[PDB]
Design an enzyme around this catalytic site. Structure first.
Site, short mmCIF file in Angstrom:
data_model
loop_
_atom_site.label_atom_id
_atom_site.label_comp_id
_atom_site.label_asym_id
_atom_site.label_seq_id
_atom_site.Cartn_x
_atom_site.Cartn_y
_atom_site.Cartn_z
N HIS A 44 3.87 4.12 -6.37
CA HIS A 44 5.00 4.37 -5.48
C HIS A 44 5.34 3.14 -4.63
O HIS A 44 6.26 3.15 -3.82
CB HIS A 44 4.64 5.55 -4.57
N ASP A 93 -0.53 8.17 -9.06
CA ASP A 93 -0.04 7.08 -8.22
C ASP A 93 -0.92 5.86 -8.45
O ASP A 93 -1.77 5.52 -7.64
CB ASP A 93 -0.09 7.50 -6.74
N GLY A 186 2.07 1.03 5.00
CA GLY A 186 1.76 -0.37 4.83
C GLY A 186 0.40 -0.55 4.20
O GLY A 186 0.09 -1.61 3.63
N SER A 188 -0.62 1.49 1.86
CA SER A 188 -0.48 1.97 0.48
C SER A 188 -0.91 0.94 -0.55
O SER A 188 -0.62 -0.25 -0.42
CB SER A 188 0.97 2.32 0.13
N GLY A 189 -1.56 1.42 -1.60
CA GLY A 189 -1.96 0.54 -2.66
C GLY A 189 -3.30 -0.05 -2.33
O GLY A 189 -3.93 -0.61 -3.21
B1 LIG Z 1 2.50 3.13 1.81
C1 LIG Z 1 2.00 4.30 2.64
C2 LIG Z 1 0.71 4.19 3.26
C3 LIG Z 1 0.17 5.24 4.03
C4 LIG Z 1 0.87 6.44 4.23
C5 LIG Z 1 0.26 7.56 5.06
N1 LIG Z 1 -1.08 7.80 4.53
C6 LIG Z 1 -2.06 8.56 5.23
N2 LIG Z 1 -3.23 8.74 4.74
N3 LIG Z 1 -1.76 9.12 6.48
C7 LIG Z 1 2.26 6.58 3.58
C8 LIG Z 1 2.77 5.49 2.81
O1 LIG Z 1 2.46 1.90 2.56
C9 LIG Z 1 3.49 1.10 2.01
C10 LIG Z 1 4.55 2.14 1.70
C11 LIG Z 1 5.54 1.65 0.61
O2 LIG Z 1 6.00 2.72 -0.18
O3 LIG Z 1 3.82 3.27 1.28
#
Ligand SMILES: *[B@@]1(C2=[C][C]=C([C][N]C([N])=[N])[C]=[C]2)O[C][C]([C][O])O1
Length: 237
Positions: A44, A93, A186, A188-189
């Site tokens: 994502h 994902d 932020g 994510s990944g």
């Molecule tokens: B992600 C992203 C990271 C973290 C969350 C919330 N996660 C938790 N465990 N509360 C949502 C999204 O960071 C970059 C973004 C780009 O799509 O998605």
């Protein structure tokens, strides 16, 4: 990362910061070095990304401030998204980034081992989530890579906290019943590293959650061990 602290430089050598250069350069997602030319991250993370040309992978980074126009980076040759992926909350994902060039390992940048199918019964008691993400649902990218120790929660326990969702065995959750520590936008990944018997394993990939660090709302991660076959298939030329 919510409720975490500054990491020590080189403490998470497999952690990379993935930037997009459009419209102007900025941190997009976290990721993990798993091979000389491979970064494992979240699918994502590439929403609205139609070409690898606007991506830049930076390894051996502690502070975003270290990244300047003259800083070296790894170009992305190919973005490989799991064919069953639709959206974070539905699972799958996971994505691979094939780098244009090979990473020369060193104390500042090295791969993290993937978990083995023979470690599903093993109980990780030393897991950490890392990243440059928000410190609160409404915030901004952090300069210094943050780290937070978080306990894994059983899928049954996790399913109870996410009634409107289906927590499958291809997902793994981590958090405190009372919240306070968790991944956030932020991150994510990013990797969910767990140290067992003196060896770090990439147990999960930061995927999603309801808000950030809320009470009774564990972070949800891609259960990496469930994709070792996929990873092998996609990385073997
Ligand atoms: B992600 C992203 C990271 C973290 C969350 C919330 N996660 C938790 N465990 N509360 C949502 C999204 O960071 C970059 C973004 C780009 O799509 O998605």
């Amino acid at each position: 990362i919510v409720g975490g602290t500054a990491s020590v430089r080189g403490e998470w050598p497999w952690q990379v910061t993935l930037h997009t250069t459009s419209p102007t350069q900025r941190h997009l997602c976290g990721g993990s070095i798993i091979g000389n030319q491979w970064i494992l991250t979240a699918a994502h993370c590439f929403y609205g990304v139609e070409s690898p040309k606007i991506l830049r992978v930076y390894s051996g980074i502690l502070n975003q401030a270290e990244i300047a126009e003259d800083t070296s980076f790894f170009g992305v040759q190919e973005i490989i998204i799991h064919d069953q992926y639709k959206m974070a909350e539905s699972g799958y994902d996971i994505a691979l980034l094939k780098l244009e060039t090979t990473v020369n390992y060193a104390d500042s940048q090295r791969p993290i081992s993937l978990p083995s199918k023979g470690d599903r019964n093993v109980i990780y008691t030393d897991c950490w989530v890392t990243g440059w993400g928000y410190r609160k649902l409404r915030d901004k990218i952090q300069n210094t890579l943050q780290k937070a120790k978080i306990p894994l929660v059983t899928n049954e326990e996790c399913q109870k906290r996410y009634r409107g969702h289906k927590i499958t065995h291809k997902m793994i959750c981590a958090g405190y019943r009372e919240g306070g520590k968790d991944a956030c936008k932020g991150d994510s990944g990013g990797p969910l590293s767990c140290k067992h018997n003196e060896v770090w394993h990439l147990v999960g990939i930061t995927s999603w959650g309801e808000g950030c660090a809320q009470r009774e709302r564990p972070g949800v991660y891609t259960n990496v061990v469930e994709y070792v076959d996929w990873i092998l298939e996609k990385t073997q030329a």
